[PDB]
């Protein structure tokens, strides 16, 4: 199970934050600072996985953007590292040449993509072809 999914930049400005368990705001906050203090200090010579409190973080950088996924420790690292990736690959289809800005000025629909490919802590859709097919049938909606 995925505890949460973060998308912050090199400065730690959160730009997407789907949480999958009940947290206070004061928790959600310290929680984000920490995911920063941890993922930002690692230098490629290290690995894409980190112990993080009782869970662990799968993460990959893309431009100025860190894509973090927090998961149960007994979770499949390579699986979630490619989930993360093909998620980005769906954003770059929807937005076309997606970048930090599309994700900001469109924060409200970033969420409808996330929830299409992840739900209730677990993976939901994996097929890029179908998720584009629906994202594009909405958007045609009033």
């Amino acid at each position: 199970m995925i505890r949460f999914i973060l998308i912050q930049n090199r400065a730690g400005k959160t730009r997407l934050a789907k949480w999958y368990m009940q947290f206070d705001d004061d928790e959600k906050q310290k929680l984000i600072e920490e995911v920063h203090a941890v993922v930002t200090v690692r230098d490629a010579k290290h690995t894409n996985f980190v112990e993080f409190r009782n869970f662990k973080i799968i993460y990959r950088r893309y431009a100025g953007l860190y894509f973090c996924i927090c998961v149960d420790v007994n979770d499949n690292n390579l699986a979630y590292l490619e989930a993360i990736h093909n998620f980005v690959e769906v954003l770059n289809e929807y937005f076309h040449n997606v970048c930090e800005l599309d994700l900001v000025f469109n924060f409200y629909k970033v969420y409808t993509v996330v929830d299409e490919m992840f739900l209730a802590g677990e993976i939901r859709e994996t097929s890029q072809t179908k998720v584009l097919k629906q994202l594009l049938m909405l958007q045609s909606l009033e």
């Binding site: 930049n9 090199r10 400065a11 893309y62 690959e89 770059n92 997606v98 930090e100």
Partner: peptide, 9 residues
């Protein structure tokens, strides 16, 4: 830090 750089390609 120039937030307009592509995430891919």
């Amino acid at each position: 830090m120039s937030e307009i750089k592509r995430l891919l390609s």
